Amino acid sequence: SGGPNTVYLQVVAAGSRDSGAALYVFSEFNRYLFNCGEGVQRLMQEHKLKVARLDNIFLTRMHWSNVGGLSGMILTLKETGLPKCVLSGPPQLEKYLEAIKIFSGPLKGIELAVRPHSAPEYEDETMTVYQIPIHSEQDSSLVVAFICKLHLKRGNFLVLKAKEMGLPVGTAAIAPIIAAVKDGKSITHEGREILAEELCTPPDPGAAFVVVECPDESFIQPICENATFQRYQGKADAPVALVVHMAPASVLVDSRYQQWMERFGPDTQHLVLNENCASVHNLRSHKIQTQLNLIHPDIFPLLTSFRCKKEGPTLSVPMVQGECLLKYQLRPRREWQRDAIITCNPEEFIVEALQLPNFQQSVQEYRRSAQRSQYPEIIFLGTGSAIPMKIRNVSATLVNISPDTSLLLDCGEGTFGQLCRHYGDQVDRVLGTLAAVFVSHLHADHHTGLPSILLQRERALASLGKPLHPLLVVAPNQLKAWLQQYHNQCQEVLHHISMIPAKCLQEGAEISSPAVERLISSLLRTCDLEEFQTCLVRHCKHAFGCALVHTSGWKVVYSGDTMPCEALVRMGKDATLLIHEATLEDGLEEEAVEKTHSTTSQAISVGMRMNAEFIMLNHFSQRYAKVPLFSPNFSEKVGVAFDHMKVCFGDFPTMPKLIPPLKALFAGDIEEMEERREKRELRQVRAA
RNA sequence: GGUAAAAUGGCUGAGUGAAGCAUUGGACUGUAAAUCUAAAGACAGGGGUUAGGCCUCUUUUUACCAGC
Ligand SMILES: [Zn+2]
Ligand SMILES: [Zn+2]
């Protein structure tokens, strides 16, 4: 077969603060993703990009925002059933993959291949990929540029020209003739030499593109001195059609970098990916939040997404900003396409909401009907399960007990993007008030994103000049193993975390080391809390919950994912609010016990038997992520948890009226789940 | 919400072009059932390479989504 005739270069991530720059290559035979940062999988799912079917993943910098989402992509590939997958990047990649198996489990069902930089190159029928290691003058100092060249595209045959004279067009005899013409062998027939030039166009050797990342000025000189780039610079046998620079704005304005890259020539297109992007990625989440805000303000606050404040400076050659969903076309025609750019238009969402069936009447009735502690802020950053999707992110909740103190509690993959989308530009101040973080259990979706929040908190603290206060993390002994396995070859950031085992915090437990001594004290008398206790749950090995009591006598208990635990009862008694799991729903008791989930019915049961004033669910299943069915058991002490939800103690006599409008908003989706899940599960149970 | 499999007609086998069973007037047959010399409906809805077969966007049908 001939060379590919449809190659597209697209960006899934614009290199924003939330997530690092990510590329995407679409070809008729193979697909590539290059850098796999945090949240790139969710963006690909949102943009309809096929998560599976990926052939190669190329890593450049080996940095968390560039490799944080690799675990999620690997898990998704494993679930999808992809048989083969190849990973390439720095030679120490295999070490990172090994640490993943500690908590992610064996990678059965999918074959993973690690290609170190020592390998010469990787061949393909669609294009060839090289690798030129780069070393800085100042291991996190190693970056790699790939440089990709396409294959020969055979010229099309002039069928009309051949038919004009009387060649056997439309018959099997034409196949050898066209095969010989395309190959390059002259064909003589009918007593004359037709020659290939009169039957086909000259062959096209194909273009090429270069991917290079310059984290800082330190890498400018090594890049300039690179010998390989010299051959492709200026005139060359394979002109480079496009080059992408994943470098900060300051580095781009550097005179040396501009002079070196200017040798590429005027025909070379340049693309820059950095924090200066001006595109919005998640339209569905923004629409959902805007629609929810129309019901009750101050409980679903507007995202107030950050926006660029400085226009890109003029340079020697015009530049095209990274943006989102920007695609560059190769092979058929070299041009830029912008027919799929994402823009935020809240007016359309408002108009669509105004046309909802009877939603306006319900909202008006609720408003007509509507018409204590002031800062017990509780915000649910995420409420979904593992494998985050567009509608919601993995479970993650934060509480702002005091303006100067806060508790992160569970923190899943990333969640700094969620924090930025929630508080906007105010995250910098908020991130500096973080006091401690607690992980639920060994599952990756609850503790995989810790490095990102750690780095972001460190950056925020350094921005204001405040000294460095080590963060307190309450995780089992399993987490420390992963942390020590990591950071030994990439970052060495062990100074930003202090471990406090949860076993010593268990009710009736005893301190087993002086390290916890004065450490529990530092944790206390700082969050306005009186004693902190934990206990095991019936979920899996090394699973613990947390109970927090304020100095004023307000008590809140968080359990997480587990079966109804009798030990939890009699310990969280008189708790103002409680947090449980509602992964599954009624009618799936067999799956609930098999999957080790309480389910909504058992959670509500313990809720009435727990005496807690308020019962709040969490960790909604992906099958009912849009909204869980409101069972008749709902009472004044229950509620519904949603992403970016904000609830105060004074809202207790206010939320009951929200059920009608919330159920009205989700009509089509609720009908879909009712028609799909309940009947199917009932039929399956009856058959079995 | 995601993954796997098939979209051809009254039914059904594939990709040189379309192949097998069923019926319209009936001949052997007083009798309308035996064996045909003609008949027909024809590859779900787009588009990229020019070609069917290849890849992508929707629509309809079956199955699956579990404790680390
Ligand atoms: Zn879990
Ligand atoms: Zn969980």
Nearest residue to nucleotide B55, by CA–C1' distance, is A28
Cβ neighbors of A128 (< 8 A, separation 6 or more) are A121, A122, A148, A149, A151
Clarify whether residues A378 and A501 are in a common domain: yes
- Which bases of chain B come closer than 7 Å to a protein CB? 1-4, 16, 48-51, 55, 57-58, 64-68
Residue at A656 is within a domain:
no
* Cα Rg of chain A, angstroms: 29
Clarify whether residues A184 and A84 are in a common domain: no
Q: Are strands A320-321 and A269-272 parallel, antiparallel or unpaired?
A: parallel
CA→C1' distance for A189 and B16 (Å): 25
Helix, strand and coil percent figures for chain A, each rounded to 5: 30, 20, 50
* Element at A579 (helix H, strand E): strand A577-579
CA dist., res. A647 & res. A641, Å (int)? 10
> What burial class does residue A176 get, using C-beta atoms within 10 Å of its C-beta: 0-12 exposed, 13-18 middle, 19+ buried?
exposed
CA→C1' distance for A167 and B43 (Å): 30
* Edge-to-edge order in the sheet of strand A31-32: A111-115, A84-88, A56-58, A31-32, A21-27, A7-14, A327-330, A335-337
Clarify whether residues A326 and A430 are in a common domain: no
> Which nucleotide has the shortest C1'-to-CA distance from A597?
B67
- Give residue A398 CA to ligand 1 midpoint distance, Å: 18
CA dist., res. A439 & res. A452, Å (int)? 15
- Give residue A462 CA to ligand 2 midpoint distance, Å: 33
- Give residue A620 CA to ligand 2 midpoint distance, Å: 9
DSSP letters for A654-668:
TGGGGHHHHHHHSSH
CA dist., res. A146 & res. A23, Å (int)? 13
Clarify whether residues A78 and A192 are in a common domain: no
Clarify whether residues A525 and A413 are in a common domain: yes
Q: What CATH number did the domain enclosing A509 receive?
A: 3.60.15.10
Kindly state the tokens that stand for A603: 């959670």
Under a CB-based contact definition with an 8 Å cutoff, are residues A223 and A229 in contact? yes
* Element at A421 (helix H, strand E): helix A416-423
CA→C1' distance for A626 and B35 (Å): 67
- Give residue A72 CA to ligand 1 midpoint distance, Å: 15
- Give residue A561 CA to ligand 1 midpoint distance, Å: 6
A594 phi, psi to nearest 5 deg: -65, -45
Clarify whether residues A443 and A583 are in a common domain: yes
- Give residue A562 CA to ligand 1 midpoint distance, Å: 8
Residue at A212 is within a domain:
yes
CA→C1' distance for A29 and B8 (Å): 28
Under a CB-based contact definition with an 8 Å cutoff, are residues A211 and A23 in contact? yes
> Which nucleotide has the shortest C1'-to-CA distance from A101?
B68
DSSP 3-state of A11:
strand
Clarify whether residues A184 and A223 are in a common domain: no
Tell me which ligand sits closest to the C-alpha of residue A413: 2
Q: Are strands A555-558 and A577-579 parallel, antiparallel or unpaired?
A: parallel
- Give residue A13 CA to ligand 2 midpoint distance, Å: 27
> Which nucleotide has the shortest C1'-to-CA distance from A542?
B68
CA dist., res. A457 & res. A377, Å (int)? 20
Residue at A265 is within a domain:
yes
What number of residues does chain A have?
688
Beta bridge partners of A157: A200
Strand B-proximal protein residues, Cβ less than 7 Å: A 5-6, 28, 45, 48, 50-52, 79-81, 103, 105-106, 156-157, 159, 170, 172, 332, 389, 442-443, 539-541, 591, 594-596, 622-623, 625, 669, 672, 684
- Give residue A590 CA to ligand 2 midpoint distance, Å: 18
> What burial class does residue A493 get, using C-beta atoms within 10 Å of its C-beta: 0-12 exposed, 13-18 middle, 19+ buried?
middle
Clarify whether residues A45 and A176 are in a common domain: no
Largest CA distance in chain A: 105
Under a CB-based contact definition with an 8 Å cutoff, are residues A685 and A640 in contact? no
Q: Which of A440, A425, A359 is nearest to A618 (CA)?
A: A440
Residue at A568 is within a domain:
yes
CA→C1' distance for A446 and B30 (Å): 91
Cβ neighbors of A633 (< 8 A, separation 6 or more) are A601, A604
Q: Please state, as a whole number, how many other Cβ atoms lie within 10 Å of the Cβ of residue A33.
A: 21
CA dist., res. A507 & res. A531, Å (int)? 10
Number of structural domains (chain A) is 3
Please give the torsion angle defined by the CA atoms of residues A582, A541, A387 and A593, in that order, rounded to the nearest 10 degrees: -40
Tell me the C-alpha to C-alpha distance, in Å, between residue A411 and each of A91, A105, A557. 30, 20, 17
Q: Which of A399, A466, A408 is nearest to A432 (CA)?
A: A466
Name the residue range of residue A41's domain.
7-153+204-276+312-337
Under a CB-based contact definition with an 8 Å cutoff, are residues A78 and A41 in contact? no
Helix axes A477-485, A93-104, angle to 10 degrees: 170
> Which nucleotide has the shortest C1'-to-CA distance from A76?
B2
- Give residue A581 CA to ligand 1 midpoint distance, Å: 10
CA→C1' distance for A44 and B28 (Å): 74
Q: Which of A300, A305, A299 is nearest to A289 (CA)?
A: A300
Residue at A666 is within a domain:
no
Tell me which ligand sits closest to the C-alpha of residue A396: 2
- Give residue A626 CA to ligand 1 midpoint distance, Å: 20
Clarify whether residues A170 and A58 are in a common domain: no
Nearest residue to nucleotide B2, by CA–C1' distance, is A80
Clarify whether residues A194 and A128 are in a common domain: no
CA dist., res. A637 & res. A392, Å (int)? 24
Residue at A366 is within a domain:
no
> Which nucleotide has the shortest C1'-to-CA distance from A676?
B1
Residue at A425 is within a domain:
yes
CA dist., res. A452 & res. A408, Å (int)? 13
CA→C1' distance for A150 and B8 (Å): 39
CA dist., res. A411 & res. A200, Å (int)? 61
CA dist., res. A562 & res. A352, Å (int)? 39
Clarify whether residues A88 and A181 are in a common domain: no
Under a CB-based contact definition with an 8 Å cutoff, are residues A180 and A217 in contact? no
> What burial class does residue A374 get, using C-beta atoms within 10 Å of its C-beta: 0-12 exposed, 13-18 middle, 19+ buried?
exposed
Q: Are strands A31-32 and A21-27 parallel, antiparallel or unpaired?
A: antiparallel
Clarify whether residues A239 and A324 are in a common domain: yes
Cβ neighbors of A255 (< 8 A, separation 6 or more) are none
Residue at A301 is within a domain:
no
